[model samples]
Target chain A: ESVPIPCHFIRIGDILILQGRPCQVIRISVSPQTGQHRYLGVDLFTRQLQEESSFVSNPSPSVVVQTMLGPVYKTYRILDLHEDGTITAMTETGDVKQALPVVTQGQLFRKIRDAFSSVRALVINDGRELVVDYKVI
Target chain B: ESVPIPCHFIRIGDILILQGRPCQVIRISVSPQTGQHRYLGVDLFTRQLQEESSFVSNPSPSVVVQTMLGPVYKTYRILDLHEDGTITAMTETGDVKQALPVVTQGQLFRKIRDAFSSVRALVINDGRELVVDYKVI
Candidate 1:
């Protein structure tokens, strides 16, 4: 007796279909690489299941360094700055869909400080908002 | 006449890099592709600068097909199952960022619904504990 082949299953938001459900996007800004090309890690929120709701576990801290002109860079801090300015290095709360903002040297330090500040005020502000006609809703 | 080149200037939390100063990220989920891609956009917040600060002045939307897939799929909608055990396209507001333990076909649908619903509530729940802690000095 032989077994039949099983096919690969694809979901609605899968990459092959050129579509995805809407996600809360968090624009992440790095400190060191803001002066150069930076790659942000995008955290995608998949479907939820009922198994004692414990979201993704904490991630290990990684070293962020740059080597240029004989290693003139330092280790950058890893942080998750929310829309409301909540930094998630020591505390990881809120919806975790985030990304890194690629910036330039003239704007690198500013981006880093902004991330720190966003997390600091994350609990305070609803973030920037515009009052369009509620009728749209 | 040799003049000094002041081409590179810097500051803290005041640079308009990566589209906006206080850029807000808003994601719209699409049909997820085959385990690889999804579309997303970053909103540069630049509305009332004096009354309320923002990033830019109506930049083009960034609906990019996410080149990679990470932990959560970014489109998980929480659904509230009906009394008859049939899940509806809705969930409680308090459980927006909260995570469950499974990833089924139904989970994605639920996540999409939940995110939109809760975000809508957050807009209405003004006096609630939106801010845990913050400081401007």
Candidate 2:
């Protein structure tokens, strides 16, 4: 996983291993006094900001890995969204397998901490489950 | 209009009269101190955080004044969103007029400052120019 990236490139809601645990980027910014990039992220287990120096350089890799070395993804119109990160939707063929209309990846984060809204969104179907990648959209 | 309301009720992206100017709420939060609701907003003209105590109680009255006394609003699917607060869309009747999609109200606020991605939205057409009233939804 040598996909190293600058810390500034990390966006809010992005999932990364912080302090040896999975953390979600929340408040991200760079200092005016220095060029060093930094961000604040929430620990998945504790839901608290781990540390001020919590941001770490990336090399752990990136993105979904399934269909084309990344996860198999397909877009669908969002029909109904259940707040528990659960999405009920119809496929392009007016079909349904397991529809996930939201696709922010951090469903729980958006629900509890962030402004979660299902009124706006797009959906990508990953092979394992419907991926709702919504981000307050 | 003597219909005053508390300041804490204000939400992000809400259009407000700040310091005798029309400002847009961006970061809104209440201080740990009781009744100390406050928010930071951007000046629509200058595009900067105008003040710390930007929140104000409402009395400017409410809503639109047409048809049933409020602005006539109709829902439309956001077909195309151009960053200039410009939109191209169709009505439910396969009709076309002027479409203002991404409704975070402060289109400029979303366009320039916030992490705005219109890949998600809902719309209400206010007879005038499509009153896109969206609040991080």
Candidate 3:
């Protein structure tokens, strides 16, 4: 949560493995609605996969990805993240199913800290090319 | 060449990078022909990308990807492997330009190696959902 990463230096798909924060897998979309600015969806989770009767529930947070630019972004919900790598929560409100992986307490804390640092990666548009005109983190 | 990997540990959009070895990225396919196995094609080059304009003039020894699952099961020629994750390669012999963001070499290698080591993940057919199973040099 306190890590100061440069926005221009970071990129999409960069996994921020902070221990104290949510384990986030970022998704950057440069859509017309957001313009040249990149919209990021940071997944939120406590590093534990939920479980059902025979099937494990979703392990990621079920919250909307708070989109922001920079080396460090903050505040993600607990239900927006999914194992399939897409946000599927109908809205910001709900009791989500659990699909988390089993881990020890120490490992959980380690993942928490990792989630805090967030993701930092170079900006890329398509295959074989990077957006050179944009600023870096 | 002795490293063993699994069939479900590899994916279609991965950018396989072989540093420390002067090798040119020749062909990278994610899917196999109906009856063929998926494999990667790599070649050695004395020069870098800045020095070569066409593959016709830049010929080198081609090496097959040494995966643990008895060589890769699919073949897709990699068009370019950028420092960023995005990639433009032909999949299943299709000529349409495809795009993919850069992938983590270290994480990917670990995934690939781990996948190959596990016997529980050998029969999956879908390539995108499979985990990476590469080895560390």
**Which lDDT tens digits does candidate 3 get at residues A1-137?**
12222222234444333333333335443434422334233423334422111111222221111222212221123233344322211112333324322123234324433443321111111122111111011
Reference-based TM-score of each model: 0.13, 0.24, 0.19
Candidate 3 regions exceeding 4 Å error are A1-11, A14-16, A20-22, A25-41, A46-137, B1-22, B31-42, B46-137
Give candidate 2's whole-model lDDT.
0.40
By lDDT, the best candidate is 2
Model 3 residue B76 CA deviation in Å: 34
Query: Which candidate has the highest TM-score of all?
Result: 2
- Distance from true location, Cα of B130 in model 3, Å: 34
Model 2 per-residue lDDT tens digits across residues A23-130? 556776555444344556665445667434423332212111110011122344455546465566544456664544333444432552343333323332222343
* Candidate 2: tens digits of C-alpha lDDT, residues B18-112: 55444556776545543344656665445667544523232222111110011122334345556566566555556654645343443433552
Error at A82, model 3, angstroms = 15
lDDT of 3 by residue, B69-137 (tens): 211222233454334443444444365345433224345533533443411111111223222222122
RMSD of 2: 19.7
Residue A25 miss distance in model 1 (angstroms) = 22
Sorted on DockQ, highest at the top, how do the candidates line up? 1, 2, 3
Query: What lDDT would each prediction earn against the true structure?
Result: 0.22, 0.40, 0.28
* Candidate 3 displacement at residue A22 in angstroms: 5.4
